[PDB]
Symmetry: D2
Subunit: 226 residues, 4 copies
């Protein structure tokens, strides 16, 4: 029900804040995502482990014209700030939205969670090119190739198998990276990348047809914790 | 920007609607002040905040919202490796920030701007105790009427108002008065300094009302300690 | 092991030479107690030390070196993921540890052993203030003569002696009495608890002398905070 | 002037504490080195950067029958606990003395420093097999091949070039790893390894003729900071 937006032309990221009054934060926000994570500038901090309690409740995969998204049943959760944030969906960007020390990864997954009070936590996972990713291949095998199309998953999705083994992370306070770019979003960005094959990357690039990362936004007053 | 205050239909709950320019007061999710729950704050390797103040006070002003000492902007603190220049300091009673749900009777804000206009506020809490000598210099020329500036009669050394121990809480927040712009660095010192009850009462009476904004939800933020 | 004490030719400086068994008192480089300089201590992600004590006091003994409450060893704390069982607790005046070069008037040590004989000591500082109810139960049966045990007349709840805030300094050290064995985990709580001046004075008079070992050099160690 | 010791037989590490009363700490010490560094058990902490102010004041290389050691003039220093510890010598062990998560590296360098008050700080650098190490090759080219022999260095030694680029470290309180195994030694163990070629490793192994690492010792009451 929100105004139409995209990644280029008159509806691209530089214009989002003018597409609708609902999208104001895109242009006036000072706590926007994604960001560059400069590891030296980040603050070493006593960050609590982010406990993962996922379940295999995937409903379908959808190509919504902005990403490839797996929609979940909402029963699995992570624990952040002692609260349960339930896994609602995960989706993908290429190139990465976040950068580390000024460099992109070729691909980034976002696991989007909602607590019962309506607050959002996103877990970000970077991918590098290497070995074929078995869990990703379950989704890729049935990737809808046109926008507006959804497909049944033919294999049981285990979302935790997409996360890195090492669970060290960067944390900061940010926003959604797509309109309305609402703030008050908790970001948990895992430091260790996972792997996907070049073929998997190129399938995503070909199906999408364009890059779908928002440009990095100024840190402003924020510190990233590490 | 419209007239605003601390009670009635122009009080803090109404701010965001008084002018479109004040919208962040209502819609922002990284607003100040906050309650600082010490147990919930995250232990972090925070850099010392070095202070290089000079005695460049220009005047004291009662602007109807606070008593404010305006500076020449030559002194500075170092935050994130950058110089933030001390433009003014001013006061609130009761405190704006709380610690573990409790107010201090009084809080001072030292407001700094870097060369690109980014704002850093250093907050100092005060408790009732011995008369504060440095504060006494400002109080001796406190203008009793809003809209009046008075010249200082003594040399102001702003660093003498800060606590001796320089450990602090840090978080990202906002200005505490309209337009409540975000992108503000907050450095809140953990150790309070003392003022006499008479110094406190003079401020309370000259203001004529409490001038603290209610604490705002932390939302996605952590406080570092 | 030879007779040792807190003054004359059997005092702390002479300990290491009284018996070959006491050599570490003299040659060890990770000895306790220490001065805890808070500014020098390293901020660290220290695990909470969970306390699971039970009321299993057996007796109070004056052993000529301290007043000690001997426990049944059923209660425990969790340190490094392991259970360390509370064997006894005892007292020193003035404090053994100092903080920023200052003593507290009194310090309690809660001595624990894991299943393999590794020792963890929890230290609690006391300041003069209100009479301590839990300490009063022990004091009511304090044996006045060395070599005497007395039974308790009230149920001892040792956790009631610990401060409410459980934040602590940690370092690796030694026993503070001969043979001053190393390999001892020290958990020193930052917040003091209160005792009356009369409770303090009773202990000082029953002992008849100061029973604190002088602080020892940190050498290669850091204190975590 | 101390009693003769070695790495095997009746004079090996299990016997060091009985070889001389001077070596007592080898058998009774509870703060001995080297150790296993379990990264999960280590405590994340606000460790100060260890500033390096080395100079090229190498005097000679020596094969002393226990290691290959480069002896320095003592003018270069590192800063630890706000004090200058001067670089006196550096030397090598294979396999590594320290282990990380129960695993050895094939080689470890130790840079030994002395403050003016007589306190020792050792910086440890792990090596893995990979590319030929240019700074190490300056020493290796003139490695004395028999115990008791010293040789002139034919190239200017720059000791800082042996340290890893990333200067993150583990710190703990320990001992010398050779008799007398004196305690009160500050250990700074860099987390990131550097590389040496297989040929460089095998030259060291061949010249030494035996492994020269002391077995790891119990952590006891200690925490390692990271
Ligand atoms: N609704 C929504 C959820 C997550 C994101 S993202 N790309 O920031 O994770 C954007 C919109
Ligand atoms: N301009 C301005 C400066 C500082 C503050 S305060 N009250 O947050 O320090 C508010 C407005
Ligand atoms: N055995 C023993 C137990 C504890 C201590 S103390 N004083 O270090 O707690 C000394 C000896
Ligand atoms: N003297 C000496 C210095 C350093 C070491 S070592 N191997 O622990 O660095 C041993 C002895
Ligand atoms: Cl946290
Ligand atoms: Cl340090
Ligand atoms: Zn996304
Ligand atoms: Zn203010
Ligand atoms: Zn004791
Ligand atoms: Zn060595």
């Amino acid at each position: 029900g929100g105004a139409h937006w995209g990644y280029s032309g008159s509806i691209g990221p530089e214009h989002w804040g003018d597409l609708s009054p609902e999208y104001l934060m895109c242009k006036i926000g000072k706590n926007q995502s994604p960001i560059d994570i400069n590891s030296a500038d980040a603050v070493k901090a006593c960050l609590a482990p982010v406990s993962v309690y996922y379940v295999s409740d995937a409903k379908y995969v959808v190509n919504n014209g902005h990403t490839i998204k797996v929609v979940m049943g909402g029963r699995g959760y992570v624990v952040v700030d002692g609260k349960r944030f339930y896994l609602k969906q995960f989706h993908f960007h290429a190139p990465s939205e976040h950068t580390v020390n000024g460099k992109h990864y070729p691909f980034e997954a976002h696991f989007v969670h909602l607590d019962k009070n309506g607050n959002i936590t996103v877990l970000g996972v970077f991918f590098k090119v290497g070995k074929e990713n078995p869990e990703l291949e379950k989704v890729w095998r049935v990737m809808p190739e046109e926008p507006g199309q959804k497909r049944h998953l033919t294999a049981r999705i285990d979302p935790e198998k997409l996360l890195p083994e090492n669970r060290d992370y960067y944390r900061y306070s940010g926003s959604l990276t797509t309109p309305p770019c609402s703030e008050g979003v908790r970001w948990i960005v895992f430091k260790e990348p996972v792997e996907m094959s070049r073929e998997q990357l190129e399938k995503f690039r070909k199906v999408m047809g364009f890059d779908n990362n928002r440009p990095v936004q100024p840190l402003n007053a924020r510190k990233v914790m590490k």
